[PDB]
Amino acid sequence: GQPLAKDKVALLIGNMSYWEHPKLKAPLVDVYELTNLLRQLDFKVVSLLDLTEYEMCNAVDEFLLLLDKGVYGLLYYAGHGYENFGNSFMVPVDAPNPYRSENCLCVQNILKLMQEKETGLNVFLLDMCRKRNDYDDTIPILDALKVTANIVFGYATCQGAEAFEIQHSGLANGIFMKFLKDRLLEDKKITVLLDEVAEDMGKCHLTKGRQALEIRSSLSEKRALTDPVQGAPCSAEALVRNLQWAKAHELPESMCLKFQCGVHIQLGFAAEFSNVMIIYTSIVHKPPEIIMCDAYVTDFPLDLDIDPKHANKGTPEETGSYLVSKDLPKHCLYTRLSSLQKLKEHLIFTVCLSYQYSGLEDTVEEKQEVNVGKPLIAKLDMHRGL
Amino acid sequence: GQPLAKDKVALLIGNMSYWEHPKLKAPLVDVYELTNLLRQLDFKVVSLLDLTEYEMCNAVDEFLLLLDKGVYGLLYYAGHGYENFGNSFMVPVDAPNPYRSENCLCVQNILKLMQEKETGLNVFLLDMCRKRNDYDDTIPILDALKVTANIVFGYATCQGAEAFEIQHSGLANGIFMKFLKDRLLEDKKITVLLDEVAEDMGKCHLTKGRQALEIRSSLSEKRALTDPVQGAPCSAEALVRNLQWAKAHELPESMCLKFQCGVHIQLGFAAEFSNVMIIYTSIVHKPPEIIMCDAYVTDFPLDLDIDPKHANKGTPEETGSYLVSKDLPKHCLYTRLSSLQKLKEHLIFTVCLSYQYSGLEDTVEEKQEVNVGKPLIAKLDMHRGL
Amino acid sequence: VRPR
Amino acid sequence: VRPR
């Protein structure tokens, strides 16, 4: 009668800042919007941007760890893709020019791993190009898939075609997401809903005859992304899974910093993606003996490679964040820490105070070290083991 | 509002009697049943059994000739199939063991040719196995498809899987056809209908976890196999197309044969497939001077390779025909002429009369030659040209 | 029930 | 409108 979900887990990757290839823009925005939509459908979501091949492999391993018998598993990828000899390939940021299958992740490999975990659903939304990488010599010779009638593909374009994004100087959006976002929340069967998305996508003028949605499905059960989650977890195995999820979306506590000079510095943290965190420094209290003072954040772990142009900015938008000034507490100094999947170490930075005393020219510098542990996805220890 | 069909053309091939591979049984039955269902949906149908590679290529050429801008083109194949490097291959009866892509027809090649003709729909129902032909060394390196959002695939099984047929000693049926036949006539969108077929196919006990229906679609328009055909043909191009169809389903006129001995032999013809025709000989009148007499058909074109065990049989079922004694006029001698696609020549056979005169032992033999031209698909001249 |  |  009613199809049920043991859990609903999603892994969303958005690559933009390619090292050897044209950088993209819509992946950030699309990822942000899919997460919010997928959360409304009660999904355990993992949002990640600009992953390298190694990094990409670990996100799949963390995602696989969250899938068990009956769990609805969804994968969304927005970035560079190629299709060779019936295999789809997602291209990581670190990819060389020219690249091969070795340099890339094969979707079919991810699918097999999911089937090994007895998942109820296997949805794949590949928002990438699907042309031949003429430079790819290697043909993976992959093992046959087990017939499980729960596999669903939402290809943004068709084989040998391109998926497009509108790069309008402001936000920038992806074409697949423009038609998907308005229909995702519907209680239709996943296949039926994807096909209704395909119709509205044909009505697109910008892409007509260049990009069309391609649905491939084996699904033989009225399963949908709206299907309810087996009420009371109460199972020991179900409890381990909720801990493992919670382990990745832990944000540092908004601390207050007291300085030897009697100055108070409020330190706030915001979440943008599992990979992205925003710090803000507000000067909450200062003694009468000091009137001039600016608080600034420095000495970040070199693993993170934090550009100075993305740190200590008057507004969050100046750091590159998708989050806007109405979402983030007003008047602080905002700093964007993307690439947390690069943190092997514990997060330690210095909150540096440059100040001045009444009636003196000299500029005083009070540096205070801050250890915020492993925020968000850093806490998963993706670099763990030998 | 309402999607329209310029015409609805179908090409149905059913291979059974493989030379180097296991012979099948359900393809005959499935083909017969799809034709009848497709005709109720007003389709110009071409039904063909046991085609060789060369033969197969000509059926596609005749089918392509019947497709123009706006025409709904459908292809159904039931026989041996393999899938290598993202290409589906139909195996002809003449295929060697081991076989390669060269020996087979690549569906993708047929699809391209259809797109070149500006067809409104492109439906493909591949009722075949989809495993690796480990012996196939060649990878076709086919050209990219034009994005036309009208391509629909109805794979009987998934990649690396098998499509099954129930060989119950009597009729024998295919699994894809068992679930398809009960739902084909529905006014649903082709994709939606195929997905509802997939659900009922999951309810199958014989195949569960071995075979599942796989739908692949780009179709962005509420197009269905029930969509109506642009009323009055009245176009010169539309008239050429109806002639070309009628050219293939022409059956010889039920002639009466007068013999020098004053005996009458009624000669009837029945249609089973575009490839298959049944002749029947009834002794309508004989003079009092003759009481013993049997009419028998011989000297068939050697191109046809007519086995004696399929000719001059008391009932149609004894010849191997799907047509039963309630469909064919009672009491004659029935003879089955399959393989008309093998006729290059004009159809000439002798209707041989063995008789006896009152009060004499000696047996008299009166042979009369009969030229019935090119019945059915023979009339298309598939062997024409240099 | 045999394969194709 | 650019490709991915």
What does DSSP assign to residue A35?
H
Q: By three-state DSSP, how is residue A237 classified?
A: helix
Hey, what amino acid is at B218? Answer: S
Residue ranges of D 1-4 with Cβ closer than 8 A to chain A: 1-4
Tell me which H or E stretch contains A28: helix A26-40
Instruction: Give the strand order in the sheet containing A364-371.
Output: A290-298, A348-357, A364-371
Q: Are B213 and A218 in contact (CB under 8 A)?
A: yes
Of A145, A195, A201, the CB nearest to B159: A145
Catalytic residue at A331? no
Q: Are A351 and A265 in contact (CB under 8 A)?
A: yes
Distance CA B175, CA A147 (A): 15
Tell me which H or E stretch contains A126: strand A121-127
| SS3 per residue for B195-215 | HHHHHHHHCCCCCCCCCCCEE
Distance CA A373, CA A252 (A): 8
Chain D residue nearest residue A211, CA to CA: D3
List the one residue out of B321, B353, B315 whose CA is nearest residue B334: B315
Whether residues A186 and A38 share a domain: the answer is yes
Interface mutation vs chain C, best among B164, B176, B207, most C CBs within 10 Å = B164
Burial group, residue B258, by CB count within 10 angstroms (0-12, 13-18, 19+): exposed
Distance CA B315, CA B338 (A): 16
Ramachandran quadrant class, A324 (left: phi over 0; alpha: psi -120 to 50; beta: rest): beta
Query: Which residue in this structure is represented by tokens 């006990």?
Result: B205
The last residue of one of the domains, among B180, B212, B245, is B245
Whether residues B99 and B216 share a domain: the answer is yes
Token reading at A231: 């009420």
Distance CA B62, CA B75 (A): 13
Whether residues A265 and A220 share a domain: the answer is no
Of B22, B80, B165, the CB nearest to C1: B165
Measure C1 CA to nearest chain B CA, in Å.
4
Interface mutation vs chain D, best among A165, A179, A205, most D CBs within 10 Å = A165
Whether residues B144 and B290 share a domain: the answer is no
**In chain B, where does DSSP find H-type helix?**
26-40, 53-65, 107-115, 175-180, 190-202, 236-246
* Strand ranges for B50-150 from DSSP E: 72-78, 80-84, 87-91, 105-106, 121-127
Asked whether the beta carbons of residue B218 and residue A158 sit closer than 8 angstroms, the reply is yes
Distance CA A218, CA A196 (A): 18
Chain C residue nearest residue B174, CA to CA: C1
Domain total in chain A: 2
Q: Are A127 and A13 in contact (CB under 8 A)?
A: no
CATH of the domain at A231: 3.40.50.1460
Whether residues B289 and B265 share a domain: the answer is yes
Distance CA A233, CA A165 (A): 40
Phi, psi of B376 (to 5 degrees): 55, -130
Query: Which residue in this structure is represented by tokens 């887990």?
Result: A9
Q: By three-state DSSP, how is residue A347 classified?
A: coil
Whether residues B65 and B146 share a domain: the answer is yes
Q: State the catalytic residue, choosing from B57, B104, B106, B129.
A: B129
Of B131, B151, B191, the CB nearest to A195: B191
The last residue of one of the domains, among B245, B278, B310, is B245
Asked whether the beta carbons of residue B129 and residue C4 sit closer than 8 angstroms, the reply is yes
Name residues whose C-beta falls within 8 Å of residue A9's C-beta, 6 or more positions apart in sequence: A43, A44, A46, A63, A66, A67, A71, A72, A73, A74, A245
Whether residues A36 and A184 share a domain: the answer is yes
Distance CA A196, CA A206 (A): 19
Whether residues A266 and A235 share a domain: the answer is no
Structural domain for B18, as ranges: 1-245
CATH of the domain at A320: 2.60.40.3360
DSSP A146-182: P--S-EEEEESS-TT---EEE--TTT-EEHHHHHHTT
Name residues whose C-beta falls within 8 Å of residue B351's C-beta, 6 or more positions apart in sequence: B257, B265, B267, B281, B295, B296, B297, B367, B368, B370
| Chains near C (3 or more Cβ pairs under 8 Å) | B
What approach was used to elucidate this structure?
X-ray
β C2-3/A151-155 pair status: unpaired
Whether residues B211 and B66 share a domain: the answer is yes
Tell me which H or E stretch contains A53: helix A53-65
Tell me which H or E stretch contains A369: strand A364-371
| Chains near A (3 or more Cβ pairs under 8 Å) | B, D
Q: Do chains B and D touch (3 or more CB pairs under 8 A)?
A: no
Distances (CA, A) of A26 to A53, A77, A279, D1: 20, 12, 24, 11
Query: Which residue in this structure is represented by tokens 């083109």?
Result: B73
Verify cis geometry, omega within 30 degrees of 0, for the bond prior to B288. Answer: no
Q: Are B114 and B184 in contact (CB under 8 A)?
A: no
Q: State the catalytic residue, choosing from A57, A104, A129, A383.
A: A129
Distance CA A171, CA A325 (A): 15
Whether residues B380 and B290 share a domain: the answer is yes
Hey, what amino acid is at B310? Answer: H
Whether residues B197 and B335 share a domain: the answer is no
Q: Are A39 and A32 in contact (CB under 8 A)?
A: no
The last residue of one of the domains, among B180, B210, B245, is B245
Q: By three-state DSSP, how is residue B359 classified?
A: coil
* Strand ranges for chain B from DSSP E: 8-14, 44-49, 72-78, 80-84, 87-91, 105-106, 121-127, 151-155, 164-166, 173-174, 214-217, 255-258, 264-271, 277-285, 290-298, 333-337, 348-357, 364-371
CA torsion B23-B28-B34-B36 (nearest 10°) is 180
Chain C residue nearest residue B211, CA to CA: C3
| CB pairs < 8 Å spanning A and B | 115
Q: Do chains B and A touch (3 or more CB pairs under 8 A)?
A: yes
Token reading at A126: 């590949």
Whether residues A371 and A341 share a domain: the answer is yes
Catalytic residue at B129? yes
DSSP A250-261: -----EEEE-TT
